Amino acid sequence: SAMEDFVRQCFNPMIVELAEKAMKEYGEDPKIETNKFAAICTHLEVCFMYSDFGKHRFEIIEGRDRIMAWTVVNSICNTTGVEKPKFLPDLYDYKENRFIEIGVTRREVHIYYLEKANKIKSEKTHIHIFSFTGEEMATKADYTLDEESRARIKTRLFTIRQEMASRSLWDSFRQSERGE
Numbered sequence: 001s002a003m004e005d006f007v008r009q010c011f012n013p014m015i016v017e018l019a020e021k022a023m024k025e026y027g028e029d030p031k032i033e034t035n036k037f038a039a040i041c042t043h044l045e046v047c048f049m050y051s052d053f054g055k056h057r058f059e060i061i062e063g064r065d066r067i068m069a070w071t072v073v074n075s076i077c078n079t080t081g082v083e084k085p086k087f088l089p090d091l092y093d094y095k096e097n098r099f100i101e102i103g104v105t106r107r108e109v110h111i112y113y114l115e116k117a118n119k120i121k122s123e124k125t126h127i128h129i130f131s132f133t134g135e136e137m138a139t140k141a142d143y144t145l146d147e148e149s150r151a152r153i154k155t156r157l158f159t160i161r162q163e164m165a166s167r168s169l170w171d172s173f174r175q176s177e178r179g180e
């Protein structure tokens with residue numbers, strides 16, 4: 001139906017294949033859990049943009065299989081002494097020397113920030129939350145990126161939102177917490 005079609009028009013093949021593998025892992029069907037499909041693609045693409053806006057400053061951990069992701073986190077810990085996270089984060093920042101958790105929410109950015117902060121309960125992992133309304137929230141209000149990069153992410157999220165809205169998919173998507 002329409003959600004899968006939108007996902008295939010708007011995200012590039014590699015992001016789609018990754019998100020489908022992420023679904024198959026749990027046991028989820030992208031033709032059924034279409035909002036989650038879309039949410040997974042959107043989070044993947046934001047993580048990749050964030051990382052590409054970096055000598056590379058960021059290490060992408062999101063998108064790898066679990067073995068490789070924990071291998072990367074483990075390597076970074078052993079070579080920096082940075083404390084190991086309890087949950088797989090999304091990126092490592094070699095400039096600030098900290099892991100980053102990236103949130104993408106359809107609700108208020110502060111609501112989701114509190115949710116993430118309460119979940120990961122690690123004072124060391126930096127948290128950065130983007131909404132589809134051009135809003136952000138980050139630990140200590142440290143946004144890591146320069147204005148143009150954060151703006152490119154904001155524009156892309158809002159675009160995804162407006163594309164769902166013109167297809168009439170947005171209301172189902174923002175009323176669903178699935179994918180956050």
Ligand SMILES: O=c1cc(Br)[nH]c(C2=NCCN2)c1O
Pocket residue numbers: 043062088089090102103104179180
């Ligand atoms: O932002 C996120 C929201 C949700 Br739900 N899951 C994850 C995740 N990272 C590694 C495995 N699962 C996020 O990074």
Ligand SMILES: [Mn+2]
Pocket residue numbers: 062088089090
């Ligand atoms: Mn992640």
Ligand SMILES: [Mn+2]
Pocket residue numbers: 043090101102103104
């Ligand atoms: Mn994340």
